Design a protein around this ligand. Sequence first.
Ligand code: KR0
Ligand code: CA
Ligand code: CA
Ligand code: CA
Ligand code: MG
Ligand code: MG
Lengths: 10, 9, 480, 945, 99
Amino acid sequence: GGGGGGGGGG
Amino acid sequence: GGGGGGGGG
Amino acid sequence: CDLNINDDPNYPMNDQVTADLIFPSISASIASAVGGEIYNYAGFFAQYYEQKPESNQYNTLCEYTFTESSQQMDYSYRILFAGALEDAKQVLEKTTNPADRFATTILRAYAFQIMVDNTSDSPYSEALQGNANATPKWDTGETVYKGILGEIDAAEAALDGSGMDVPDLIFNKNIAQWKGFANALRLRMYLRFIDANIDAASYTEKVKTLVQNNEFFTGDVKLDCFLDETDKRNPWYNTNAVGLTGNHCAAYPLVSYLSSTGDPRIAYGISKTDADGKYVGQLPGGKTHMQSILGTDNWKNKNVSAIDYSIGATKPVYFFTQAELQFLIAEVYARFHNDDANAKSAYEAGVTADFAVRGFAGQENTILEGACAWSAASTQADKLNLIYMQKWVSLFYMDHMEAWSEIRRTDCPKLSSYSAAQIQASESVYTPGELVAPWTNGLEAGGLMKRMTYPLSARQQNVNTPAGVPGSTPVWWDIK
Amino acid sequence: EKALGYAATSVGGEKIAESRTSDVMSSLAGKIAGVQISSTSSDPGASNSVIIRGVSSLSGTNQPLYVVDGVPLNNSTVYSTDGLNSGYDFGNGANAINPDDVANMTILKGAAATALYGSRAANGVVMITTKSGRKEKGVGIEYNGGVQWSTVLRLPEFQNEFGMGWNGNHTELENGSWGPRFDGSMQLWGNVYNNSQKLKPYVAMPDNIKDFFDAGFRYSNSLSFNGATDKSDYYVSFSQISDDGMIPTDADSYDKYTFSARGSHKAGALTFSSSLNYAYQKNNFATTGQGLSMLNSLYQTPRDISIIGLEDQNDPFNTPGYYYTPYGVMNPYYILNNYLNEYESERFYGKFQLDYEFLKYFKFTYRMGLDTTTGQSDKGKPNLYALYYEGTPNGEGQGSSSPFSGETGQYSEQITRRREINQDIMVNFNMPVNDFNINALVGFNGNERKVSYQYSEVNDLTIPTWFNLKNSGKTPIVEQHMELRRLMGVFGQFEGSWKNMLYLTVTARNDWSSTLPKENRSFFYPGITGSFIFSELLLQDVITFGKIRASWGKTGNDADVYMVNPVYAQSSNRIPFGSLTFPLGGVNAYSAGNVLGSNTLSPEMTTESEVGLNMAFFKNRLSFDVSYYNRNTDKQIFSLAMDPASGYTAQNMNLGKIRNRGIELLISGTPIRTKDFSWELTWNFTKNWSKVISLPEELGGITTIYGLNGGTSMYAITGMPVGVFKAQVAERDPQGRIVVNSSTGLPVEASEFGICGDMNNKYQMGVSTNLKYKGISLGIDFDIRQGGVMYSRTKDINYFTGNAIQTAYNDRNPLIVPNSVNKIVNGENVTYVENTTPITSSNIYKYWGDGGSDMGSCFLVDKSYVKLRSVVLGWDLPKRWLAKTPFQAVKVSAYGNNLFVWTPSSNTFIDPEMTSFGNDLEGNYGEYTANPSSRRFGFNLMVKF
Amino acid sequence: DFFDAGFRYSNSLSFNGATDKSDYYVSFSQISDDGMIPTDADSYDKYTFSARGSHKAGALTFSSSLNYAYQKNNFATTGQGLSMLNSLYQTPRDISIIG
Ligand SMILES: *[C@H](CCOC(=O)CCCCCCCCC)OC(=O)CCCCCCCCC
Ligand SMILES: [Ca+2]
Ligand SMILES: [Ca+2]
Ligand SMILES: [Ca+2]
Ligand SMILES: [Mg+2]
Ligand SMILES: [Mg+2]
């Protein structure tokens, strides 16, 4: 499926 | 005011 | 109640959409992928950049721990086939202008060249059929190359002298430059067959005939139309500098090589470390290991050299750089003719062409008279290594999908024999420029990335999609 | 009526309204069998979901048809189309009705006799009936004045063992808590400003997130004016609501205003009545998402850092350039004080009805409805780059990894215009013969629904803070959109009756829809229902009521607008986290649309079978209702997923059957009843079986409903329930043991994603009690929903950030995953070996971020909960105290809603009544750091004049 | 001869009644005009709906008036450019305009 997301800083 | 234009002939 | 109101007013009438209106989409669709996420992961596989210590977007590309369900190229798969390849099919239905059909066929051909160079097989003879065939079979990569080369051939033979009447954001209606684009594509795919040892007799002679005619392109084959705006930027910059934060840092093979040769191009797209002011690359897949070994505050973003995104906002998308075209010629002379002086000439021409694009025009001599001087390449293998290692530098920050594929065809840069951990422990065993198998390597078989996974959308919706195979599986034209 | 032959429930306004919720529907959460009512979030003004007997529409219209008097009501929802980065919800069309105006609400659950309201009725019908006229004593003025607070209900349970850091090492700048075990020693933290830095004891601050919230406050004022004669009646009302919720500043805002005027006058056989209503709302929302949003920034806090110590902006260390952490987040008080996401809406709806009785047994009725709405969004965010990038750590000091790149400002505005028109012409015939009774109804329906909007956006703001389309030196982005659909139908409904014992009904309707292919607009759907009251003409007097029920029938349906003909869109390309759109560069371009049209479509047909039993005993002191239903929605037109290699990514075609079967059970009684005291108990039980039956084979048996790219995704798969989840699980050897990586210790991903449960509750139920002692009332309702799963980014971010108590698992010492093997692969030889590799301290942060041995599936969370839904304490004052006063009645009332939630052991993170993806099917995917749910409690004064 | 005959049909309905304590009026009006310039570019649609009521009860009288008004307009733009009439007048006296 579509949408994507980032990760975080660390 | 604001402008108008001539015609042609 | 007029019920005859189911014509979507948000779109034009289908008659008013002629082939001049559809055609400009094709070059842009392709460049969205090839200069975008495909360019992005290919940069990792070709070991140009690595994952920044302080962010986490691309851990699984660098450590080779993605899988088929990671959809690492579904966006591009959809753009190339349901964006570009469909628009192209519509163009060839709507116009009969052989010049337009020639540019359309070239761009269509290039699209299949990119998909095959990622997943070997590709839908082709049954693609773009709609409800007539929701589940097209995936042709073998040899059938696809052989077919689209014949398409280019038959579309060129169709030219009648008339001109292009479609908006051309690539060459601006210059039919000579389009023929040069196709012969450079012929040259690229002929060398793939040759080093795949498949009808290598013909394609050796055909590549010989091709380089003799010198009917190639001038400048770079690119899409030069981007603005530092919004939805108008270079895809790789738009995604990786606006959509996300800075994730890319310089990788160790590229940095050690540009440092060894004294290359001033080491300043283009790479930035000195914010901590000591030198150039540092990160060993592929070794972000977490470097933090483990050195500690948290000693392997931060400041301790590694960051990929510069500032030259990126309006940077064009490249389909075939001139330096790479010269380097292929250089190869054809060096190992199919007996012409060391034409080889040296095309080699030097490529290095000169690239020094000029990256803004160091007039400095090429620092490698053409120093460490990468053709004079000091004794064997015909030390010459080929030199042509290939400079082809690799040349394609950094220009066309990463090709860099990955030329690494795979020619297997140069060589894969080092030492591990990431052995290189980190004692640098002297490492030959600068050689690839390093990732420190964390999700490939049960080890080694370097050989292909992309089949797109998950095809997997779920097309029963005739080949079964997933590990990243280590070579593409039909890589045989060592 | 209640000669009905299918499940229905009646509630009067007093129950609707006693809860003093702003909304007519949310009070009924868990109070009616087969009616799944849920709020999208605790944010003021947000939408309410209402699904009746499961999901039939695969995308994506499952709300019931709201019918008010009785004209269809617009129930359109306004929520963000990108829930991942800018999640917000601004309300749904039913939230506009003022509950104080409701006399009766009747929910028709079954879809076998829907000839009266048409296709939309297959999702069920919510028939509301508004109050009319008196005469009473004395002037006819009722005032309700309310006040209520909201506080935060459930935050994730945190670890308070380790503080700011990464890899288990100390840090001065992290957005997380993988540091050392708390010392009490004095360490540094935060950025450095003017050669100075903050220094604090390294201790835990367990209340830090809890202390960040305020108390929401809400004040309401409602008035009504009433009167009647023997030929006429007149009602006029006004309601006012102003909510500023628990998140600090005024970003949680909802102002509701309504005005209504309803009248009827009879002159002979003719009756003309009319209702006209205006609704206002102003929503402001604290935007959610994975970027620079408030809650995402808030969860990414070390356990030792004082959050409420960050609000003072005259403290340089809190200014955006010197904020203590530069990792993809910002000072939450900055985001709330400097971002914008406002909505203002104006809405007019009403009806006109002309009744005329003629020739003893006939009655002509013309009824016409109009509902129109103008809504206007305004969102903006500052040019963070211009203001704070140069010269600060967070900053130029971060380079390309600064949260200010490329945050150059943005401002958009959109004006939506909605409009629906409904017209009914009917003729009724009602005549008794020899104990029989005949009631015929012949009618015509005409429907017209229209929506349009105008969007316009500018980026890269010249003056950093000003939000205006003039404030940019770059190209503006404009978009325009409009849809229009029409429907006409003719219908008939035959009611047969024998001696108030045997009731029979036959319904038939043919529709002509604009959204079906021109050669196939017409669809016909009949129905039949029966009711047999064996109470009457069965002695005792033990059985108050005994009625048996049965129904079989069909409801047809059309498709969404513009699904038949192919279109060409303005060329654009969707790339990860961006777009490339035409024009380029000076050229405009068109592209072939990715959704294949179809002119072979046929209509949708829902068929339902239902049988039911209703009995009362001991003069209604014991009463139960049981329904058994079998629902099949067939040929639903849907944009079905397709291989992009075909040239399109979807094809519109008629789907297979989506089946909903189950049981609806209600039991109530009054175990104690004296003159001054009564005690009632109510128990209702729903169990629904959901199953997609087939999805067209030719395109696969699977299709996405919502889902992240390479992440957890919710599907509709052929032989499985609606809303199947797939997510990454770890690899196992043939003998059950977990495969891990020889060198890192971390789990190894399996080849394919694993199925991980569905969206559906396995059962739902509620239990109520109601005490009345003289003037005092008490009501206590419990909502109980068990089973299913939902994606939770709140668990995601708290695992990743090292803040959830689970991540303190092994005292964070190096550990070998229990039962771990290594997969020894040589070419084609597979061998497994006991794993010797520990996960090092430095890598434990990543073990939990990925979701431990569970990997991605770890973040599918159990949907189950028991909830103290509402408690209402009412005191009706004795009529004697009001005599030398102007007052006819006075009732003080204390109440509380969403008061306490109980979840299984495994969910210590969210109130499962949460989404970021709207109030229908796609919302069931999960919550994407939706704002915390709240606990609400207040007072209400009622004053009759 | 270039001009047509504009056409307009109108429909107005009112509903009325009262008692000694109450009065109630409801009305609807529709107008559709297509003027004398040829084609439908000179058009006006007008719809109104109104409900007016009052109720007396004791010293207290409450009353309300609510109205909805719709219009759609199409204008044959005028002016010194490529407008209909400016084109119409700059016609030689020997040219058949209906041709
Ligand atoms: C949209 C739906 C399409 O259906 C119709 O055309 C309605 C026709 C029936 C008119 C009934 C008149 C009853 C007379 C007592 O409908 C519309 O867009 C509205 C068009 C105009 C209707 C005006 C209604 C006047 C009522 C006083
Ligand atoms: Ca607030
Ligand atoms: Ca412990
Ligand atoms: Ca006219
Ligand atoms: Mg397309
Ligand atoms: Mg190879």
